[PDB]
Write a protein that binds this ligand. Structure first.
Ligand SMILES: Nc1nc2c(ncn2[C@@H]2O[C@H](COP(=O)(O)OP(=O)(O)CP(=O)(O)O)[C@@H](O)[C@H]2O)c(=O)[nH]1
Ligand SMILES: [Mg+2]
Ligand SMILES: [Mg+2]
Ligand SMILES: [Mg+2]
Ligand SMILES: [Mg+2]
Ligand SMILES: [Mg+2]
Ligand SMILES: [Mg+2]
Ligand SMILES: [Mg+2]
Ligand SMILES: [Mg+2]
Ligand SMILES: [Mg+2]
Ligand SMILES: [Mg+2]
Ligand SMILES: [Mg+2]
Ligand SMILES: [Mg+2]
Ligand SMILES: [Mg+2]
Ligand SMILES: [Mg+2]
Ligand SMILES: [Mg+2]
Ligand SMILES: [Mg+2]
Ligand SMILES: [Mg+2]
Ligand SMILES: [Mg+2]
Ligand SMILES: [Mg+2]
Ligand SMILES: [Mg+2]
Ligand SMILES: [Mg+2]
Ligand SMILES: [Mg+2]
Ligand SMILES: [Mg+2]
Ligand SMILES: [Mg+2]
Ligand SMILES: [Mg+2]
Ligand SMILES: [Mg+2]
Ligand SMILES: [Mg+2]
Ligand SMILES: [Mg+2]
Ligand SMILES: [Mg+2]
Ligand SMILES: [Mg+2]
Ligand SMILES: [Mg+2]
Ligand SMILES: [Mg+2]
Ligand SMILES: [Mg+2]
Ligand SMILES: [Mg+2]
Ligand SMILES: [Mg+2]
Ligand SMILES: [Mg+2]
Ligand SMILES: [Mg+2]
Ligand SMILES: [Mg+2]
Ligand SMILES: [Mg+2]
Ligand SMILES: [Mg+2]
Ligand SMILES: [Mg+2]
Ligand SMILES: [Mg+2]
Ligand SMILES: [Mg+2]
Ligand SMILES: [Mg+2]
Ligand SMILES: [Mg+2]
Ligand SMILES: [Mg+2]
Ligand SMILES: [Mg+2]
Ligand SMILES: [Mg+2]
Ligand SMILES: [Mg+2]
Ligand SMILES: [Mg+2]
Ligand SMILES: [Mg+2]
Ligand SMILES: [Mg+2]
Ligand SMILES: [Mg+2]
Ligand SMILES: [Mg+2]
Ligand SMILES: [Mg+2]
Ligand SMILES: [Mg+2]
Ligand SMILES: [Mg+2]
Ligand SMILES: [Mg+2]
Ligand SMILES: [Mg+2]
Ligand SMILES: [Mg+2]
Ligand SMILES: [Mg+2]
Ligand SMILES: [Mg+2]
Ligand SMILES: [Mg+2]
Ligand SMILES: [Mg+2]
Ligand SMILES: [Mg+2]
Ligand SMILES: [Mg+2]
Ligand SMILES: [Mg+2]
Ligand SMILES: [Mg+2]
Ligand SMILES: [Mg+2]
Ligand SMILES: [Mg+2]
Ligand SMILES: [Mg+2]
Ligand SMILES: [Mg+2]
Ligand SMILES: [Mg+2]
Ligand SMILES: [Mg+2]
Ligand SMILES: [Mg+2]
Ligand SMILES: [Mg+2]
Ligand SMILES: [Mg+2]
Ligand SMILES: [Mg+2]
Ligand SMILES: [Mg+2]
Ligand SMILES: [Mg+2]
Ligand SMILES: [Mg+2]
Ligand SMILES: [Mg+2]
Ligand SMILES: [Mg+2]
Ligand SMILES: [Mg+2]
Ligand SMILES: [Mg+2]
Ligand SMILES: [Mg+2]
Ligand SMILES: [Mg+2]
Ligand SMILES: [Mg+2]
Ligand SMILES: [Mg+2]
Ligand SMILES: [Mg+2]
Lengths: 416, 134, 76
RNA sequence: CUGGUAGUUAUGGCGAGAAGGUCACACCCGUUCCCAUCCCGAACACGGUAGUUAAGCUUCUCUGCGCCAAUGGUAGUUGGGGGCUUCCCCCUGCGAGAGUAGGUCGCUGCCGGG
RNA sequence: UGGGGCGGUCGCCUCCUAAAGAGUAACGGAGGCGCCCAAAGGUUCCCUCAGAAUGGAUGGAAAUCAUUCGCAGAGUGUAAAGGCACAAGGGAGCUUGACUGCGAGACUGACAAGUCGAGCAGGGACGAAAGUCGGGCUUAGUGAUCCGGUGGUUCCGCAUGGAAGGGCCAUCGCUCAACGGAUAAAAGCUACCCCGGGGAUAACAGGCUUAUCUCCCCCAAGAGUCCACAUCGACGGGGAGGUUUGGCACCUCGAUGUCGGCUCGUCGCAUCCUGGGGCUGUAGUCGGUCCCAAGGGUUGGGCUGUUCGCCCAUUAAAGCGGCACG
RNA sequence: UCCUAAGGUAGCGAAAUUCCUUGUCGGGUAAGUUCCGACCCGCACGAAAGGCGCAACGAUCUGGGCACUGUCUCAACGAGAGACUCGGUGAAAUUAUAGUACCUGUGAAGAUGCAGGUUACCCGCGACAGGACGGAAAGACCCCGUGGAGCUUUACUGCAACC
RNA sequence: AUAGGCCCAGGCGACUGUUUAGCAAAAACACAGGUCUCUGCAAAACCGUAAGGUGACGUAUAGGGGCUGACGCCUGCCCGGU
RNA sequence: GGGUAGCGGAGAAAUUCCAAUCGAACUUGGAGAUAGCUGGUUCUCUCCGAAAUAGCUUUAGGGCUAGCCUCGAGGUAAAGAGUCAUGGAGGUAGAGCACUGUUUGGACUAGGGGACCGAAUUCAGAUAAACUCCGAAUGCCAUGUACUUAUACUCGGGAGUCAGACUGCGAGUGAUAAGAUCCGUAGUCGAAAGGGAAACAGCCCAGACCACCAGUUAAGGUCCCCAAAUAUAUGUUAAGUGGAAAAGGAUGUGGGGUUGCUUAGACAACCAGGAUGUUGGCUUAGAAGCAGCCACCAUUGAAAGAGUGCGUAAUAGCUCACUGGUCGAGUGACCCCGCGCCGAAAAUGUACCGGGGCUAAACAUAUUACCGAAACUGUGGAUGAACCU
C-alpha cells in the first residue's frame, strides 16, 4: 500500500472539516496509506502554489520525515500550479479530480463505464498539454527561415493531435446511446411503471433493492452487490417486482455519488442516470445516522439538477433507523419515511407506501364470464386482484379491481 | 497476482527458450494438468485470469496448483524517447515456459468439470496446450 | 541518465607455459590471484602469487589431493 | 604380536558392537629442582609407578551415513544438408549431468622390542 | 553524444556481458578508490571460528560462565572476485628486511610506462638449528617534461688562484581530476551576419518497423423485466491495414518550396443516402444489427489564418480515407 | 511570532501584459474563438523604463451601421493593345549523345531508357501546364572547421586618459 | 470634363514634423513641458601629440550630460548591496 | 560655390548614408596570406596486391606508432601449414540443488495468543548473466622420431588504410521490431566478370592470358515464349491449394488401430399397440406426465416413462421412449496419421506463378537420360617465376 499525504485549504468553504475527511476515505479506497494531513486557513488559493510559499516548506519537511511519495490536494490544480509545485517538491502531485478518476478506472468492469472514464480522463490532460508543451519547448529545434519544413509551431500541432482522439471517443460514446435505447424498447413499448432509487454513497440503496427482491420477485436468485466498500455499484440494474396482489413495476439501482465531483464526469453520469429521468417516482435514501446527513441531501439534489432529473415525484427515505436511540420505525410523515433496510416490516411497509403513488387508478368493477368459453378468468386472476367470484349456472360472475386499460379491454364482458 | 517480494538485481537479460523443459513434465499433485505444446512467455496477469476462470467454474470445489512462477522481469521505454541513455524502468513479471511443461493442476472433481475447467483456462493463455492425465 | 559505464583493464591471467614444454630458469608459468595452482618441485610462488621456474627443465602439471593442483619442473 | 615413522584421490572417513594387555604405549601419583598459566602443575616441564584396561591405542564384525562406480539410454554439440525461423528437422563423428547394477569398515615401505 | 543543446561522463581497481586459453564494443548491468597501520610489518613459539540447545541469572531476543553438537554456516583494515583451518584467521616474547649495490630469465606491451624474479656481495633481526625476512592473503590509494627549494659530492669552473654559476646522487612543490598534462596566465551574444564543406547529420516529403493507432475476430463472467450470444460484452488471447503518436537515419544540403483556402479531379470500400436480403426484445408506425452491393448523389451561413470544433437554418444524405497531408 | 534593508500604497486589471482560456455574467447577431460593459482568481500591472484620464489631430490598429455596387449567387456582351495569317529585320536563358509511350514490379528504398505485359502508321500547327526530383542561385535553416567578423561583461592580458 | 461618402465605439501616440535611397511610414524618432546632475571663466564638455579651436565674440534667467515626454490629478516603502 | 575621410565622418537614431558596394568604402602593396576543406592531376604493357583495426591525441571526415601490401639482402639445432598419436590449462552448452538469492503444496512448531498468526525442522516439487556437488563438443598451448605440404623469421627502401556493407551462427541495447545499433565468429561484395534467383553489389554455382561455327559437367531446369522428358512406377489434392497471413471452427478426403449389435434377422423406413389404480401426493382459483416441490410402486402384458417434445387456461389433442410384424446386408462408438477448407480488406490497371497456360505442366517416394558457365578438357599461340642441361 502506497504512502501518501493529504493537503487542503479552507478558502471560504463551509464543511472544511468534513470535505477533508472524505479525501481520507477516497484515499483509502485507492489503496493508499494516508500518513499525515495538512490544513491551512486562507481566504483564497495561491495563484502559483495553492498553499502559499510558506507551507510549501513544511510539506517538503513533513513528507521527508514521514516517507511520503505522492501528495494529494483537496481541490483541482491549475496547470501552472502543478508545474510550480513539482519543482518546489520534486515529488509526484495529484489533485482530487484525478483521485476519483483513479477510483473509477479500477472499478469499471464494462466498456459502458470504461469508455466514459477514458474520455473524461483525456479531457483532463488537454489543459496540461501546455506544461508538457512548455518543457518540451526547450529542444524547440530553433533556427529560423527554413524554407523546407513543416507548417505552424509545435504548440499548434500537439494540441491538434489530442483533440483528434477526443472527437473519436465522442463518436464511439454517441453510438453508446443508440445501443442502450434498444434494450429499453420492450419496457417503453409497454407502460410498466419504473421507480428509481437515488441517494448519497453508502446510504443503504443496494440493501433496499436486495430486500424488495428477496420478498416480491419471482426469480429471487437475482441479487445485487451490497458491501461496506465506497462506490460498490458503478452501474444501473433493473429488477421486476410483483406485489402479492398482482401489481408489477420495475426497480432500478444507481451509482452513488459524492461532492466535489469533476464537471467532466457529470457528462458521463448524464448517460448512466437516464433511468431516473424517465422514472415516474424517486426514492431518496439518506443515511439518517450520520449527523452530516443534512449536508448530504444538498449535494445530491444539486447533482440531479445538472443531469436533468426533475419534476419526478420524490419520496424521502431515511435508512439506518435502528442505530438511532429510541426510534419507533417505521413511520411516515409528509413524503418522508423512517426505516431500516434490514427488517422485513420496513420493507413490507415501504411496498404498501408505493402502491398509492403508482396504482391508485385501479377501480372496482364486475364482469360475467361464461363457463363454456373462459380463458379470461385466468387473465383476471393475473392482471387484477379478485375479491369474490360467484360461480353461477349461467357462468362466472366476478368482482375485481382492474386497471383503466382493462375496463375498456373487457368492456363487453362487464355487467350491471 | 504473483510477484516476488525481493530481487537481487532489478534488470535482467531476456534469455532464450530452446529445448524441452528441464523438469516438471509429469503431473504429480493433482490428477489433471495443462501441458504446453510450444514455448512462450507468460505474464502474471495471464496466470491470474486463467486461475480465476478455472476456479469459478468448479464453484470453489477441489484444489488447484500453480506450477509456474514469474521470477523474471522486463522493462520498457515510453513513447517519444530515443535509443540509448541506459535501460528502461521495469514493467512486469514473466515466466519463460518451454514446451512439455505442465503448468496447471486439478484435483477433487470428476472428469467432465475438470476437463471443462481446463478448457476454459486454456483460452486465456497465448500458448497451445493439451490436457493430460496421471 | 546512466550511473554505470566504467570498468578496469584486464590483467592477462592464465597459464604462460604448456605441459611438457622445455622451460628456462626464472620464467613465469602461471599468473593468478590467490592460489588456484600450488607450487610443486623446483618452482616458487611470487609476491603476487605468480609461479616461476627455478631451474631449467620440463613443465608438468601434476595433481595433489582431491581438489587442488600443482606444477613442477624436472631437469633434463 | 607390538611401538615408532612415511607414501597413496575417504574403496582409507563417520557411526555401531565385542575382545585385549602393565612386553610396549597410556591413564595414574607428586611439584624439591629446570620450566609455565592475561588465574589455575588443566596444558606445558620435571621426578616416580600402589591401581587400571574405563578411555586413549590395537584387533575383530557390518552397508546405517558417507565415499568410489559401470553398461544401456538421453540432453548437448564439431562438420554437411533442409524448413512453416520465440524456434524446429535429417546424416556422420564425439558424448555428458541425474538414476542404477556393483565395490568399501583399506593397501604398501623402513627401524626397534616379543 | 542514435542531429546539436540541456542532463550525464572523462584517471585507477573488482564482477557479469565475454561465446570453458588470452583479448573483445555500446549514454550496457552492479560496486569502490585519490587511503590506513610504529603494529594492522619481520621472526620464533602456541591455538581455532559463526551459531544452536540445557542451568544458574542480577540480566529480557541478545552481554559474562559450564557442557554438548558444530568443515567454516565466522574472520581476513577497506569494494568485489580468486584463495586461506599442515593458516593467509587469533594470542605472547624479541625487534625495524617498511635494508644498501644489483640481478640470469620471463609476463604485458605501438611508445612512454607497468609486473614477477632465482641468485651474488655488504651489514643485520628472529631462531638451538634448519631456515625466513628487499612492508601489509593477492589485485586500487596516483600524474611525465620544463622550472624552482633543501642535503651530500675524491666533477667542471671562459688567462692563472678563488668565486658566481652549473653537473651528478637523494628528496620536496599539481582536484595540471578535461587525470599522455596545448599557455605561467582566459567567459558570453549574433535575428545585422560572412566564408569552406556535408544528405558522413537535423526540420517537409519518400523508405523499413508496427510499440502506439484504426478496424476485424477467439473464450465467455456478466448486463439485457426471465434470458451469455435481439443488442452490448469485462479479465485475458489472435490478426489485418499503413490514415495517428513514435523508432531508424537509407535518396535529396552544386536547393526535392513548407500550412490553410481557390480551380480541377480521380481511385479504395472498412457504405452516409438510394437498391436486394437474413435475424429481431419483428403486432402496426418508427427502428437496431449483419450479408450482397462503389451506379449516381453526398448544403448555405456566424466565430476563428485556422484543419478541427461549437452554433443557426435546411436535406434522401450532409461517409471515411489514398494520390509529394493530390 | 520569524526573517529582512523594507515587505507593492493610490490607481488600474483576461490588458499591445492571462498559460489554463473560446474564464464567468450582460449587450449586439437567426447563429459572434473577434468587439463593447462588468467580476477580480494580477501564471508574470503598478507609479518620471512614470500610474490613471483626456477635447483636437492620424494614408495608425480594431468592432458595428446608412448609402452603393459584377466582390459574389453565376456568369452575357461589346471596344482597343498583344496573341493568330502575310512581307522586312531578327535574340536569349538551356544543352552528355538520343529513333525520347502506358501499367505493375525491381533498383542508392519515388524510372522515357531495367523486367513482364498492354498499347502505338510518318511529319506538323493553335492551346494547358502533370513529369523531365524542370531553369536561376557550390542552401540561408541544421551540423562541422582547434574559419572569420560585429557586439557585451565582476573572462585573461594589455593601452590611452585621469588621480 | 474637373470638384468631400457619412456615422457610432475602443487601443496607441498629445498635436504639425522625421525615419530603414531599393520589402517595414508605424504604437518607433523628434517635439514644447518636467526633473536630476556638472560648470566661477584659460568654465565644464568635445577635436587635436601639441600649437590652435568649438563652446562663445557667451557668463549661472548661461552652457554640457542622463531620464521622462502637451495638458489634468498624482508620483507610495527600502540607503543593507553597487 | 564650399567644409567634415575610413583606428574616420554625418545621423529628428533605421546598423542609416559616405559615387548602383557599408556590423565598417575604393585602389595598390605585404601576397603566390592561410585553408587538417571541395574540385582537378595528361602514354602503354608485364608481375604482385591491401585496409576500413588497436593505443594515444583540443581527438573524432586530421595525425603518429603497431597491424595488413610491395622490392632487395641474409642465416639455419628448418624453425611456417594440415592431419595423426600423446599430455595439459581453462568452467561455456547441458544438467543439479551440495552454497547464495527467488519460490509452491503438506505436516509439526519455538514465540506471542484464553482457538489464531507464526520463526526454525522435515516431506515432495520448481528456478537463476552477475548460483555451482558436476560438466561436454569445439577452440587453445606443447611434444613426436609419423605422413603430406610450402612457407616462416631478421635487417633495410616505398606505400596506402583507420566512413565499411549484407548474409549464416552466438550475445547485449530495442518491443526476443527495423535494410536499426554494437561486439565475437565464417563467407561474399568492396577490388569479381560468367551461369541461376523475371529484373537484382552482399543469396546459390563458380574465379575471365588470347583465338575456335569442338567436348564433359556445377547451381538451376526439360508444354510454348526458351536449349533440353507432354520421362518411368506407386499414391495424394479439387482447393488454381501449388502461387501469402494466426488464435479458433467444421458430417472435406485417403490410410491404419481399437470396440458394440447382426441371416435364432443389424440400422433406416412402413403397419399396429403405446394402457389401468392414477387427475401419484403437496402447492395454488388450477397444476389432470409436461408453473413449482417431494416421491416414482403395482395391475395385463411382447411392450409401455407417476412421462421426451408440441399444445390448452385446466382439459381436449398430436408425438416420443418401448414391443410385435413387414423388406432383407451390414450398421455405430473411439484414437492416430497425410493432404486440403473457412478465418482472408486499399487506394492509376489484371497486379501475392516472369507471361501464356496447366487438373498436372501440382505434391511425396524412388529411378534414368538430356540441357546448362568465361568452370574443366581438346587444338594453336603469348608470357611470369622456380629448378635443371
Ligand atoms: N446500521 C445500519 N446499516 C445499514 C442499514 N442499511 C444498510 N446498512 C449498511 O450500509 C452499508 C452500505 O451498503 P449499501 O448502502 O447497500 O451500498 P450502496 O448504497 O450501493 C453504496 P452506492 O450508492 O455507491 O452503490 C452496508 O454494509 C449495510 O450493511 C441500516 O438500516 N442500518
Ligand atoms: Mg533563431
Ligand atoms: Mg523554423
Ligand atoms: Mg449500490
Ligand atoms: Mg577486471
Ligand atoms: Mg607477501
Ligand atoms: Mg606488496
Ligand atoms: Mg606379556
Ligand atoms: Mg617449589
Ligand atoms: Mg572422495
Ligand atoms: Mg554412456
Ligand atoms: Mg555418468
Ligand atoms: Mg572463447
Ligand atoms: Mg577469456
Ligand atoms: Mg566498455
Ligand atoms: Mg563512482
Ligand atoms: Mg611548459
Ligand atoms: Mg679545480
Ligand atoms: Mg678562472
Ligand atoms: Mg570523480
Ligand atoms: Mg587545459
Ligand atoms: Mg587524455
Ligand atoms: Mg594509459
Ligand atoms: Mg528585431
Ligand atoms: Mg555558405
Ligand atoms: Mg543519410
Ligand atoms: Mg522523416
Ligand atoms: Mg523523394
Ligand atoms: Mg549506421
Ligand atoms: Mg542540380
Ligand atoms: Mg462490403
Ligand atoms: Mg434489415
Ligand atoms: Mg457509389
Ligand atoms: Mg456580420
Ligand atoms: Mg500537400
Ligand atoms: Mg505523411
Ligand atoms: Mg502519407
Ligand atoms: Mg474573453
Ligand atoms: Mg483587445
Ligand atoms: Mg458572451
Ligand atoms: Mg473588455
Ligand atoms: Mg513596467
Ligand atoms: Mg521607475
Ligand atoms: Mg508613456
Ligand atoms: Mg491608460
Ligand atoms: Mg482621447
Ligand atoms: Mg503626420
Ligand atoms: Mg492587334
Ligand atoms: Mg514576321
Ligand atoms: Mg524495393
Ligand atoms: Mg517505380
Ligand atoms: Mg519494356
Ligand atoms: Mg505545338
Ligand atoms: Mg531545381
Ligand atoms: Mg554547399
Ligand atoms: Mg571576434
Ligand atoms: Mg504621432
Ligand atoms: Mg523601403
Ligand atoms: Mg574662442
Ligand atoms: Mg519615452
Ligand atoms: Mg518613485
Ligand atoms: Mg549606499
Ligand atoms: Mg549607508
Ligand atoms: Mg568640395
Ligand atoms: Mg562621430
Ligand atoms: Mg537592430
Ligand atoms: Mg544597410
Ligand atoms: Mg537619415
Ligand atoms: Mg551606395
Ligand atoms: Mg609573407
Ligand atoms: Mg593475383
Ligand atoms: Mg576518410
Ligand atoms: Mg604505418
Ligand atoms: Mg543453462
Ligand atoms: Mg617493410
Ligand atoms: Mg582508430
Ligand atoms: Mg571506424
Ligand atoms: Mg564492424
Ligand atoms: Mg537485422
Ligand atoms: Mg546496418
Ligand atoms: Mg574503395
Ligand atoms: Mg558476380
Ligand atoms: Mg550475375
Ligand atoms: Mg525475386
Ligand atoms: Mg524447346
Ligand atoms: Mg495463391
Ligand atoms: Mg489450424
Ligand atoms: Mg482494383
Ligand atoms: Mg551432356
Ligand atoms: Mg580456365
Ligand atoms: Mg595449350
Amino acid at each position: 500500500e502506497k504512502k501518501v499525504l493529504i493537503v487542503g485549504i479552507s478558502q471560504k468553504q463551509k464543511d472544511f472539516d468534513y470535505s477533508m475527511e472524505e479525501l481520507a476515505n477516497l484515499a483509502a479506497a485507492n489503496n493508499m496509506e494516508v500518513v499525515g494531513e495538512i490544513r491551512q486557513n486562507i481566504d483564497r488559493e495561491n495563484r502559483a502554489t495553492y498553499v502559499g510559499k510558506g507551507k510549501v516548506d513544511e510539506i517538503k519537511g513533513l513528507a521527508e520525515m514521514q516517507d511520503a511519495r505522492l501528495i494529494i490536494f483537496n481541490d483541482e490544480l491549475s496547470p501552472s500550479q502543478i508545474r510550480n509545485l513539482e519543482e518546489a517538491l520534486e515529488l509526484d502531485v495529484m489533485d482530487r479530480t484525478g483521485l476519483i478518476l483513479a477510483i473509477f478506472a479500477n472499478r469499471a468492469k464494462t466498456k459502458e463505464a470504461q469508455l466514459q472514464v477514458q474520455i473524461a480522463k483525456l479531457q483532463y490532460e488537454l489543459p496540461r498539454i501546455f506544461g508538457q508543451g512548455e518543457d518540451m519547448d526547450q529542444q524547440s529545434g530553433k533556427g529560423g527561415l527554413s524554407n523546407r519544413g513543416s507548417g505552424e509551431k509545435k504548440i499548434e500541432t500537439d494540441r491538434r493531435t489530442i483533440k483528434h482522439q477526443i472527437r473519436h471517443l465522442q463518436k464511439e460514446l454517441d453510438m453508446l446511446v443508440d445501443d442502450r435505447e434498444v434494450r429499453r424498447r420492450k419496457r417503453k413499448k409497454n407502460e410498466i411503471p419504473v421507480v428509481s432509487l437515488v441517494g448519497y454513497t453508502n446510504a443503504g440503496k443496494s440493501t433496499t433493492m436486495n430486500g424488495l427482491v428477496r420478498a416480491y420477485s419471482e426469480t429471487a436468485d437475482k441479487q445485487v452487490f451490497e458491501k461496506d466498500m465506497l462506490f460498490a455499484t458503478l452501474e444501473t440494474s433493473v429488477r421486476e417486482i410483483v406485489l402479492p396482489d398482482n401489481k408489477q413495476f420495475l426497480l432500478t439501482d444507481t451509482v452513488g455519488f459524492v461532492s466535489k465531483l469533476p464537471h467532466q464526469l457529470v457528462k458521463a453520469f448524464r448517460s448512466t442516470l437516464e433511468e431516473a429521468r424517465d422514472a415516474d417516482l424517486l426514492i431518496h435514501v439518506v443515511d439518517y445516522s450520520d449527523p452530516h446527513y443534512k449536508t448530504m441531501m444538498k449535494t445530491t439534489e444539486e447533482t440531479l439538477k445538472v443531469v436533468g432529473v426533475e419534476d419526478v415525484p420524490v419520496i424521502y427515505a431515511y435508512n439506518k433507523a435502528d442505530l438511532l436511540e429510541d426510534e419507533m420505525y417505521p413511520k411516515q410523515t409528509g413524503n418522508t419515511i423512517i426505516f431500516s433496510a434490514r427488517e422485513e416490516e420496513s420493507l413490507e411497509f415501504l411496498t404498501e407506501v408505493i402502491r398509492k403513488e403508482l396504482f391508485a387508478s385501479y377501480e372496482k368493477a364486475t364482469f360475467l364470464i361464461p363457463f363454456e368459453a373462459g380463458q379470461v378468468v385466468a387473465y383476471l386472476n393475473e392482471h387484477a386482484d379478485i375479491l369474490e367470484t360467484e360461480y353461477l349456472e349461467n357462468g362466472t360472475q366476478i368482482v375485481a379491481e382492474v386497471s383503466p386499460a382493462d375496463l375498456q379491454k373487457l368492456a363487453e364482458y362487464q355487467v350491471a | 497476482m504473483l510477484v516476488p517480494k525481493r530481487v537481487k538485481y532489478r534488470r535482467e537479460f531476456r534469455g532464450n527458450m530452446r529445448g524441452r523443459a528441464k523438469g516438471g513434465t509429469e503431473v504429480a499433485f493433482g490428477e489433471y494438468g495443462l501441458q504446453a505444446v510450444e514455448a512462450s512467455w507468460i505474464t502474471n496477469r495471464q496466470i491470474e485470469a486463467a486461475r480465476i476462470a478455472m476456479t469459478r467454474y468448479m464453484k470453489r470445489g477441489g484444489k488447484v496448483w500453480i506450477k509456474i512462477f514469474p521470477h523474471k522481469s522486463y522493462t520498457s521505454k515510453p513513447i517519444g524517447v530515443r535509443m540509448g541513455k541506459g535501460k528502461g524502468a521495469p514493467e512486469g513479471w514473466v515466466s519463460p515456459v518451454k514446451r512439455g511443461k505442465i503448468m496447471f493442476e486439478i484435483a477433487g472433481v470428476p472428469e467432465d468439470v475438470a476437463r471443462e475447467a481446463l478448457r476454459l483456462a486454456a483460452h486465456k493463455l497465448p500458448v497451445k496446450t493439451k490436457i493430460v492425465k496421471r | 541518465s546512466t550511473s554505470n559505464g566504467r570498468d578496469s583493464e584486464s590483467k592477462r591471467l592464465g597459464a604462460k607455459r604448456a605441459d611438457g614444454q622445455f622451460v628456462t630458469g626464472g620464467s613465469i608459468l602461471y599468473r593468478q590471484r590467490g592460489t588456484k595452482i600450488y607450487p610443486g618441485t623446483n618452482v616458487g610462488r611470487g609476491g603476487d602469487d605468480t609461479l616461476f621456474a627455478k631451474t631449467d627443465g620440463v613443465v608438468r602439471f601434476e595433481r595433489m589431493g582431491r581438489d587442488k593442483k600443482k606444477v613442477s619442473v624436472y631437469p633434463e
